[PDB]
Amino acid sequence: PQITLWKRPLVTIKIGGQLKEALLDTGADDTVIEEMSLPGRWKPKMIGGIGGFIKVRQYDQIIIEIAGHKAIGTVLVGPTPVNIIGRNLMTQIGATLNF
Amino acid sequence: PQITLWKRPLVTIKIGGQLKEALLDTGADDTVIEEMSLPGRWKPKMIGGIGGFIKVRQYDQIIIEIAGHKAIGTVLVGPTPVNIIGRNLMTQIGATLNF
Numbered sequence: 001p002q003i004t005l006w007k008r009p010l011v012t013i014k015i016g017g018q019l020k021e022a023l024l025d026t027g028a029d030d031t032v033i034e035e036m037s038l039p040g041r042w043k044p045k046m047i048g049g050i051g052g053f054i055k056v057r058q059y060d061q062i063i064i065e066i067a068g069h070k071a072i073g074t075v076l077v078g079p080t081p082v083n084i085i086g087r088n089l090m091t092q093i094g095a096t097l098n099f
Numbered sequence: 100p101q102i103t104l105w106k107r108p109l110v111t112i113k114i115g116g117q118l119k120e121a122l123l124d125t126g127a128d129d130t131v132i133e134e135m136s137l138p139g140r141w142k143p144k145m146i147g148g149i150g151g152f153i154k155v156r157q158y159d160q161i162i163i164e165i166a167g168h169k170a171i172g173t174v175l176v177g178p179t180p181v182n183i184i185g186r187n188l189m190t191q192i193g194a195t196l197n198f
């Protein structure tokens with residue numbers, strides 16, 4: 001689709017077989033999802049944004065459906081304020097900015 | 100133009116008589132520019148990122164050119180590691196996400 005930016009660009013995702021709402025975030029290098037049970041192995045990491053750093057669980061090679069499009073890649077899980085789809089997965093679904 | 104997401108989507112902006120590099124950020128509600136001595140009145144604000152909140156100065160009706168496209172709107176100034184162009188100004192230049 002073509003998505004305008006008058007409202008937050010929220011989409012439905014499926015991760016670990018569960019549906020969630022997430023923000024398409026071109027300013028995010030990575031994808032970070034709120035705390036959940038997720039099948040796979042993980043390693044601890046820290047990520048930083050406005051306001052500082054948070055501790056997350058890094059899961060690699062996770063299947064995630066984003067607005068009906070498949071991606072398979074790195075998903076961080078931790079105390080993010082909103083679910084965020086970052087560039088690592090937006091590139092996989094072919095998303096670009098246009099103006 | 101079209102901007103892919105393999106790398107951070109940085110563009111040149113003009114604000115306050117200065118050229119800067121800034122990130123086109125669909126996840127940002129607001130526009131946040133690194134500390135600079137902009138003239139006139141402002142209002143204190145706090146804004147929340149992934150790691151918590153920071154204190155910024157809110158300036159209204161600030162002219163800013165984004166990749167050659169003029170816009171005018173609210174600009175927040177404060178200690179950010181990156182200049183962020185948020186939705187409030189991206190809408191004004193007709194930016195969309197497409198996939």
Ligand SMILES: CC(C)(C)NC(=O)[C@@H]1CN(Cc2cccnc2)CCN1C[C@@H](O)C[C@@H](Cc1ccccc1)C(=O)N[C@H]1c2ccccc2C[C@H]1O
Pocket residue numbers: 025026027028029030031032047048049050081082084086124125126127128129130131146147148149180181183185
């Ligand atoms: C107005 C303001 C800019 C404060 N908004 C944000 O920070 C929002 C906050 N919401 C949350 C919110 C908070 C409070 C209220 N409403 C919403 C989550 C999404 N962010 C937008 C992010 O796109 C901002 C970028 C800024 C940044 C870019 C590069 C380097 C440093 C900072 C951001 O935090 N990006 C980081 C990021 C993000 C996710 C995963 C990994 C990484 C690394 C890094 O790329």
